[PDB]
Design a binder for this molecule. Structure first.
Ligand SMILES: [Mg+2]
Lengths: 100, 77, 50, 63
RNA sequence: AUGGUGAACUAUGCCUGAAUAGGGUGAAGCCAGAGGAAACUCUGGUGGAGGCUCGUAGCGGUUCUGACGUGCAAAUCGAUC
RNA sequence: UUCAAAUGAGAACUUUGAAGACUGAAGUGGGGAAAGGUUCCACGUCAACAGCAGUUGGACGUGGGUUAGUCGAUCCUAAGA
RNA sequence: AUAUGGAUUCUUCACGGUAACGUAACUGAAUGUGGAGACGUCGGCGCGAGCCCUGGGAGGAGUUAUCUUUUCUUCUUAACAGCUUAUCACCCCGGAAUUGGUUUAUCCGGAGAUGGGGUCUUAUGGCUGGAAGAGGCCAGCACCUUUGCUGGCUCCGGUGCGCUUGUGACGGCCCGUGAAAAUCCACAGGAAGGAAUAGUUUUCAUGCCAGGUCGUACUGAUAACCGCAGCAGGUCUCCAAGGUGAACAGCCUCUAGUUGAUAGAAUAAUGUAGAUAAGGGAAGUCGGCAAAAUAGAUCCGUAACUUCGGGAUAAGGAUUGGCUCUAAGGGUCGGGUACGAUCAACUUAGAACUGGUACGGACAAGGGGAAUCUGACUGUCUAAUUAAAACAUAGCAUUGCGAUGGUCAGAAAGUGAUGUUGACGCAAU
C-alpha cells in the first residue's frame, strides 16, 4: 500500500577522476522523475538524497531500477560521459557507476 | 524419487543393509515475506529408489545429522 | 539408407577397402606391366548396383 | 588462413547461428589454432570470439 | 517360331498408412412470435446439409497455337487457366 | 553486389571484418522414409574435374569416425506367398 | 532365482460401506465366459498443452540535437513417484402437471424427473520428490598459462471466436456402418493343499542377477537420390514467429541460412520480358487471338425462365482516409429467515471536423448482357500435337441362370472366380 523502496547509486568511483558531478546528478533526477506521467509531480512521493559518495532514491510511488538506469543513461549521454561510465547493479537495488 | 514424512522411517531405512551413500542438501527457501529460513533435504540412496526426507526446522534438522549411523557415507553440499 | 541389412554394409566394406590407388612398389617389380588401378571406383562416377 | 571450421564450432559452442558469430580479424593467427571445442571456449571467454548483438524487430509501431 | 525377363514407368483390384487455408450460400431438425369464421398461412431466430460454390496447398494441363525449339529439359519454362 | 585486411607466385570468385541485400516459417530453416555409400571430419594439396577462375571444393592423397534391455528390426497377422 | 518385513488362520484361506464401491496384500487346478488389443469421416461446442499477446519486478544491451518510466533481450523445470484433481457413468433418499430440467445445436424423466447426499474412470491439471546441485542471465578478482575462482538473481501475474495439436461429450451421413492376430487381464468353477507351539500367501513392499544379434556417420536434393552431368525436370512425410489482411493469400520483418548461376565496357539494328500513348474505338483478323476493362467490403436494388432447389455476386447504383467524439454489446463480488464496486474483450452503428474529391490509395481482386447447336449435371482419356459433341454416370429397359445351375477360367486335376454369394442375386447387353 504505502511501502517505500530504497534505490542507492554508488557514484564514489568516477567523482575523484573529475569527470562526474554528483551534486548535479541528484538535481537532474528531481526534475525528470515522472510520477503518473508528469515532471515535477514528485509531491513527496519520491526523494533523492545526495551526500557526495552515494545517491539514494526513496519512493512510495511507482519506481523501478530499469527506470533509474534509463534516466542515468540519459544524463551521461547528455553530458558525453558515455563509453566512459557504465550503470551497473552490484546486487539488488545497489546500483553503481563504473569508470574503467 | 519418493517422499517420506515420518522421521521414524528414515532412521529405520538408513540401516537397511543395502544403503551405501546418503546426501545432505541445503536450500535457502522463503516461507513468508517477513523472514527466510533454511530448508535441508536428507536423501538416502536405495538400490531402486531415492528417498528424500525434507526437514524445515533448523533445530530438528541438526539433530538428524548426528542421528545417522557412522557406517553411512554422508555427502554434504 | 541408414537402416540397412548386414549384407549391404558388409559389401560396402569390401568396396571401401578396394578404394585407393595402386601400391607404389608394385611398379618396381621385375617384368611389371600394371601401370595403375583400372578398377578404381568413385561414388560420383559409377554406381555399385548392390 | 581458413576459419570456417572455427566459425562452425563457435556457432555450436555459443548456441547461436553462424550469422551471429564474430571472429576477430586482428587476432586471426590465434583463432587458426583453435581446432577443438575446448579451444573455442577459451577464445569466447577472453573476447576473441564475441557472440553478437541480436537484430531487433520492434513492436512499438504495432503497439 | 522356341525359350525366358520385366507392373522401379504406367493400368486396374485388394491390404495398410498419410494429406486437403480462408470465404459464399444456407437443406432437415428445433425455438419463439404474428395474422386469423376455424382450417391454416406468414415472420424472425437456431442449426450447419450438399459427389454446391469463390478460392490456397495439392492434383491437373485450356489458350497465348508466348518463351525454348543443335533447349535447362528426348516435353521443360511464363502467363492465363 | 561493394570496400578493406590476411594468405599466395598469382584473388571478381578462398578466409576474416564491414556495408548492401534475399529466402520470409506449405523457407534458400531444422529432421526423416526410399535411394546413395563414406559423399561425414581432420590434415596435406591443385596434374585432372567444378563448361571463367581457383590458394577453394561433395575433387586428389593419407587417415579418423557410427557405442542401445528401453529407438528399430527381431514377434503377429492383412491382401497375399 | 530368492530371504526379511508385512498380510491371513483354531469361525482354516480378509475386512469395511444400505449402496454405487474401497484397501498394501487378502489360497484357487482343469474347464468355460467376458474385456482390452480393436479401429470411418465431416460439423460445431467444452477442456488441456505449446506458441502468440501483455502488466509489475530483478538483470544485460540500443537510441538519446529533441522526445520516449523507452526499444530489444533472460527469468526454464524432463522421464518416473506420491497425494489430489473429471465431463460422462452409477448408488441412496424422495415421489413429479401449474410439467420440469436443459444444450451453441432438443433431448430426458412413474422403466423414477427436479432436488439433497455420495461412488467411480485419472485424459488432463495442481502441489510435492526428481531439482537446482542442472540450465539461463549478470557482477567482481588474477593470468604465457593446462586456466579459473567467488558471488548473486533465476519472482509474481493477466487476457483470448487467436494459431497448431491432443482430448471429451454430441450431432450429420451411408443400398459405404468404416482389419486380423500375437499378447495381457478379469470373472464363473471348486481340484488340491493347508492351521497351534504352529502354518500359509512371491497379484503387498523391500532385497539379488542377466538382458544376445544386426542397424545407427552423412545428404535427402537448382551439387550427395533418379534423369548419360554438379541438369530451370521428378521424388512420400514432420515442426511453422510478428504486421497488414477473412486468409499456413500477396507484400515487409525476426530466428536460422544464403549472397550460388563467367565477368568487364558501351547502350546500334532486330529480338525476349515488362510498359505507356493524342483523336477514333474491332474499321484489324478466319475469329476481339492478345491486351484492356470489372474486381475487396458495407448499404440499396435485381429480370426472363425454372425440375421451385436455382438463375443471382444477375443486370444496375452509392460509400470507402485521417482525426475528435457519441451509443450499444460482458464476467466476478455486495442484501432481515432497484442499484454499487472491480476487472476485461474487439464488434457494430451514428455524428462533427479536416484534405488539391482523395481514401479495397501498394499488394490483392468476377467484365457484363440477348441468343442458337450440343453434352443432363459432378467425373474420366489419347504421358510427348486432339479434354471434346468422345467415354463414364445415375435413371430406364432387355436377356440368361434355383446350385447335377448361369457366366467364365484351366494342358490336366480329388482344379478353380463370382462364392464368406442365393433372384431386393450373379452374369451379359
Ligand atoms: Mg365464426
Amino acid at each position: 500500500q504505502k511501502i517505500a523502496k530504497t534505490f542507492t547509486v554508488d557514484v564514489s568511483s568516477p567523482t575523484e577522476n573529475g569527470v562526474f558531478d554528483p551534486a548535479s546528478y541528484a538535481k537532474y533526477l528531481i526534475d525528470h522523475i515522472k510520477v503518473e506521467g508528469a515532471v515535477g509531480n514528485l509531491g513527496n512521493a519520491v526523494t533523492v538524497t545526495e551526500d557526495g559518495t552515494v545517491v539514494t532514491v526513496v519512493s512510495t510511488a511507482k519506481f523501478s531500477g530499469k527506470y533509474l538506469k534509463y534516466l542515468t543513461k540519459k544524463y551521461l549521454k547528455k553530458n558525453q560521459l558515455r563509453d566512459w561510465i557504465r550503470f551497473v547493479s552490484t546486487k539488488t537495488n545497489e546500483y553503481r557507476l563504473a569508470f574503467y | 524419487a519418493r517422499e517420506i514424512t515420518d522421521i521414524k522411517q528414515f532412521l529405520e531405512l538408513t540401516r537397511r543393509a543395502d544403503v551405501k551413500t546418503a546426501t545432505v542438501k541445503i536450500n535457502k527457501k522463503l516461507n513468508k515475506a517477513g523472514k527466510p529460513f533454511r530448508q535441508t533435504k536428507f536423501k538416502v540412496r536405495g538400490s531402486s529408489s531415492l528417498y528424500t526426507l525434507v526437514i524445515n526446522d533448523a533445530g530438528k534438522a541438526k539433530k538428524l545429522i548426528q542421528s545417522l549411523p557412522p557406517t553411512l557415507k554422508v555427502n554434504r553440499l | 539408407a541408414a537402416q540397412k541389412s548386414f549384407r549391404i554394409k558388409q559389401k560396402m566394406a569390401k568396396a571401401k577397402k578396394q578404394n585407393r590407388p595402386l601400391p607404389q612398389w608394385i611398379r618396381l617389380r621385375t617384368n611389371n606391366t600394371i601401370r595403375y588401378n583400372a578398377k578404381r571406383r568413385n561414388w560420383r562416377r559409377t554406381k555399385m548396383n548392390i | 588462413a581458413n576459419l570456417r571450421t572455427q566459425k562452425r564450432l563457435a556457432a555450436s559452442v555459443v548456441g547461436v547461428g553462424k550469422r551471429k558469430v564474430w571472429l576477430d580479424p586482428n587476432e586471426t593467427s590465434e583463432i587458426a589454432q583453435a581446432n577443438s571445442r575446448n579451444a573455442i571456449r577459451k577464445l569466447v571467454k577472453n573476447g576473441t570470439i564475441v557472440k553478437k548483438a541480436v537484430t531487433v524487430h520492434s513492436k512499438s509501431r504495432t503497439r
